[PDB]
Design a protein around this ligand. Structure first.
Ligand SMILES: NC(=O)c1ccc[n+]([C@@H]2O[C@H](COP(=O)([O-])OP(=O)(O)OC[C@H]3O[C@@H](n4cnc5c(N)ncnc54)[C@H](O)[C@@H]3O)[C@@H](O)[C@H]2O)c1
Ligand SMILES: NC(=O)c1ccc[n+]([C@@H]2O[C@H](COP(=O)([O-])OP(=O)(O)OC[C@H]3O[C@@H](n4cnc5c(N)ncnc54)[C@H](O)[C@@H]3O)[C@@H](O)[C@H]2O)c1
Ligand SMILES: NC(=O)c1ccc[n+]([C@@H]2O[C@H](COP(=O)([O-])OP(=O)(O)OC[C@H]3O[C@@H](n4cnc5c(N)ncnc54)[C@H](O)[C@@H]3O)[C@@H](O)[C@H]2O)c1
Ligand SMILES: NC(=O)c1ccc[n+]([C@@H]2O[C@H](COP(=O)([O-])OP(=O)(O)OC[C@H]3O[C@@H](n4cnc5c(N)ncnc54)[C@H](O)[C@@H]3O)[C@@H](O)[C@H]2O)c1
Lengths: 307, 307, 310, 310
């Protein structure tokens, strides 16, 4: 008869914004925050606590230590300073951080679900699955949860409708080799790419919508130095699907074992999410262009992991 | 048949966190953000937009200009860099900022409600009321919305209950002369001060609960350099009461014209909030200690305003 | 600076269930209830008021009269006894048109200038009638239409495919009635082509048929079991109410007037439409395959024929 | 990693309205409904499923049997026909005790190991009976108690003082029934002493009396008007369900077992109590003035006397 407990590890821009989302949304009743920077944790925990009397239902926020994971239900990892303006140097640094973090978490007796946000997210989700020894269902990367929302946002602007009425997806790596699933993107059945094609310079519009999706992080970083709100909201959406046992289909980074003809790689795909984590990957039809790009994205990830 | 539109002026730590609260809560469907720092606005607006596909209902976020206030329903002012480690220098700087901002807003044909967060909030709410020429009902300062939540939070910890089950208030200036209303603070009728009195060193506990309420901002600033989550949440709570026409009693900074035997001053008091702003100030019984402190707080504010 | 005010006219099974949905959801802060049966209203208004201290945000409920519509934002009509077994379709239409002429007349006489949402059956016919009786722009008169049929179809698909209903994108369009049609050319879960998947199952053609038959005949099945339906329609009415008051620009299947869309005119019928604070912003015209085109035209014809007979 | 599962036993006016509140609120993701009247259940389950595609998050509704309680988290009992006019109190208790012995017995035989929430009247008596029949710890058996009476009192005060009900802090404690009492010594709006304010009004003593009489006699007034009450109790049951599943440590007035609190023992009765995922964490013992002490003791005595007679 325990309540719902999330432990956030990494309380930087992304983690702290995620914590605030949880205070606004009341998805869970207990939030523990762990970071090497104990002064930032202390200040954020106090500031966050002071919002909780206005939370829809009780949320308890506290500064924690690894032993606090013993009975946690979800551990969210947003730890690792962002990449400074090489990919393999970043991967090496962050893999060491994850070996340490996941080991400390598992030592506490944690037996819940991991949700990973740290970049490169597909690589670090795969690493978390390997280091934790947990079933694939219980290790999730945020993957393209955010890329898909960006794609829907830009489509909602192009077509002037609620983003909740836009069904559209980005799949593949969270990064340069991601791809739009135009064969499915629609508003109540309106074929969006086909409609854009018929606009003047509609081919340019189709390209721009995806370019602005793909390069959104860069665009935000150039403007204000970091992104955090979009990721925080995506992490909260996945958190909701787990704690409310939704069986909701969300694009997240999931392990493939044969789906899409790929094996032994975490990558962004639609998957059914519920209280046990990823129930299953959803295998959707892709057109030839989509098949080509998705295979290339998976190859890219598996190559990075070999290096 | 217009939707609900908020214009935020000042997109720093406080304003941006408030914007994110609105994206999480879907209180209103349109949010316009104005700041001198147009690059931070550009980056925040993009990042915020990317969260909106997961908002409960549609929220549209855009970068704006003053003409965008013409049909705004609420204008929220969080503009002015925080005080650098004199009070009158701060007041002078911020009063000039407000004369400019409120003048530009009124020039747009704005005819809604102002909600002010910039410190000193009671002084700047009073200034906004004077500069805008609007009825007192339509100019609100956040006042002790946050101090009251801090007080309830610390009481919820002392008594181990949901903060939503703690009825407790801070009134007076948002600052050094604020006061706890212990004559009323209760959980389902349990007299909290009386119960604390009976604990060992209970007098020390009563003092600490208020000291930690009063000095919370300082404590948070010492730890992480600024506060923003508690204020953002309080601003969102007031925003909710207005747009959902609640007639909710909240402690905010309101103009007194005879209530509590005070005139011509904005100060933190319980007030009924609804779609027209502050419907009325609620005049509660105060004990002698409370009467003394509240009068002193109002005097302090009126003295600052004379200087 | 007035709040959001809904007037419900017709406080039977459907209307009372809609009122309770509003108390649970806090979409608006004021709900006024009108019915000829003033004892039921008095009793329901008290019972509903007693739930409001636990509503998410303030909801005020009161018993009303037509003068209360003067500053109403939305008038929801669920008035008219349900069709009695053996009562002819044309007899039901005749009686409900009379009721609506009266109701809409008294509403407009209050100086109401908001939006109508109609639930009473036959909903497409009575929405059209409300539009004609009221004199309002088409944007401001909405029938619940297939808001409920679409949810039923999505529910049954969510069971067939074992996922959240919110992850099923599927629609019923046409008349809220015997002539409605599934839009299988677009029904999908994250791009999964549902009809194509079903076809591959053993006796999959049978499954496809059953999913639609169970959607089409749902009201009959519920009435046979418990005598009336109300929760599904109350929830659909609440969903449309949310789209209006939260100004969502949400695409929902409702009964809307066509003036050229789908090559039809002068008929209200169930179609996807963008809903916001001004009501129906526009009808969304989606591609239909040949079978869907055929059935949709027939549904529109059927509705126009019924109205010609009335 | 199982989800949150509620089993409702008793799908009449109260239970069905509670089910619909769960569909509106998405407190839990699975709702199973059990009743002797399997046709009503079949019809209600379909109607409710059709609302779920518009629920905030997934809610699965199904018709159930007792074996489905094995992994239920909460069993809510709203079973028993309401008391018939002229039927004696002792006759009603006798019949409902029999029903409860049967229901609780079949639930425990499923290997259920969750929490009971009981609504059936007389609720304090039947909560005590559920505690005794089930063998569970007192924390895990809760009667709705004065959850509804408190909301009624707050509603009437919110009208008297013209503010949001959520801003009125006021409570009814004691038996859910004739012997309940208002806690005027604490009823306040942001510290405003409500009884003291009312006393100062002309005929204010009359107003104070009427506010309580209208609270005490609300069910009678609603039944006289429309034959049964259900929305207020459904909403109160939903509020307790929320406190449990969201682990709130919220203070709510419910029927709880006293073992020394208020100087009473061996009785369930309406009191403020902290509610969280384990059920009733503790009873809150608040100061009562002399009049409140007198009435509360009398209410507890009345309940113990009724149980002695049964
Ligand atoms: N959509 C996405 O998946 C997405 C979006 C934005 C950012 N990111 C990534 O999220 C990560 C964090 O970004 P940020 O902007 O919040 O960075 P940040 O620098 O603000 O925060 C990183 C935090 O990690 C902490 N940390 C480092 N090592 C730790 C350890 N061993 N144990 C506990 N804490 C540790 C640091 O103290 C710091 O507080 C980066 O990898 C960034 O690229 C991902
Ligand atoms: N509870 C409260 O009332 C409370 C709590 C915390 C902070 N505050 C106050 O809120 C204010 C903002 O704090 P912050 O931490 O967000 O500061 P910040 O420095 O992060 O942001 C201030 C913003 O105001 C903008 N600005 C300045 N002049 C402007 C003008 N003329 N027009 C438009 N924009 C202008 C700046 O560009 C900057 O983006 C301060 O007064 C702070 O003390 C109040
Ligand atoms: N999806 C849908 O559009 C849908 C679903 C279910 C029911 N319905 C329809 O909704 C309508 C109501 O069904 P119900 O089961 O609630 O019926 P009901 O008999 O329970 O209630 C009808 C109410 O209308 C009131 N009424 C009749 N004439 C009136 C008038 N002139 N002014 C004010 N009130 C008047 C009656 O007094 C009664 O309370 C029926 O047409 C039914 O077929 C539609
Ligand atoms: N605030 C409150 O605690 C409150 C408020 C209103 C009503 N009530 C009480 O709630 C109870 C239900 O009222 P209602 O109006 O919903 O009654 P109802 O007659 O509409 O429903 C009672 C249901 O119980 C079912 N039932 C009877 N015996 C059963 C058994 N052995 N197993 C399974 N199901 C069985 C019946 O088939 C029926 O569907 C009554 O005791 C009533 O007085 C309590």
């Amino acid at each position: 008869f325990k309540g719902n407990k999330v432990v956030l590890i990494g309380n930087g821009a992304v983690g702290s914004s995620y914590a605030f989302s949880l205070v606004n949304q009341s998805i869970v009743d207990e939030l523990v925050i762990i970071d090497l920077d104990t002064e930032k944790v202390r200040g954020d925990v106090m500031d966050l606590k002071h919002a909780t009397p206005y939370s829809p239902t009780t949320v308890r926020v506290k500064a924690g230590e690894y032993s606090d994971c013993h009975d946690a239900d979800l551990v969210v990892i947003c730890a690792g300073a962002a990449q400074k303006p090489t990919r393999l140097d970043l991967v090496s640094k962050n893999l060491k951080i994850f070996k340490s973090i996941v080991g400390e978490v598992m030592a506490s007796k944690f037996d819940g679900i991991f949700l990973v946000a740290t970049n490169p997210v597909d690589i670090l989700a795969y690493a978390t699955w390997k280091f934790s020894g947990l079933p694939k269902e219980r290790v999730i990367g945020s993957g393209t949860i955010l890329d898909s929302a960006r794609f829907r946002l830009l489509l909602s602007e192009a077509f002037d409708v609620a983003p909740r009425s836009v069904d559209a997806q980005i799949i593949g790596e969270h990064g340069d080799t991601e791809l739009p699933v135009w064969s499915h993107a629609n508003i109540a059945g309106q074929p969006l790419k086909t409609l854009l094609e018929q606009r003047p310079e509609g081919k340019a519009q189709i390209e721009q919508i995806f370019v602005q999706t793909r390069d959104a992080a860069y665009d935000i970083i150039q403007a204000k130095g970091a992104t955090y709100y979009g990721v925080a909201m995506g992490l909260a959406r996945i958190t909701e699907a787990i704690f409310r046992n939704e069986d909701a289909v969300l694009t997240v980074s999931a392990l493939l074992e044969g789906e899409y003809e790929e094996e032994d790689v975490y990558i962004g795909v639609p998957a059914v999410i519920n209280r046990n984590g990823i129930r299953n990957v959803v295998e959707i039809p892709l057109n030839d262009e989509e098949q080509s790009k998705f295979a290339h994205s998976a190859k890219t990830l598996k190559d990075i992991m070999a290096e």
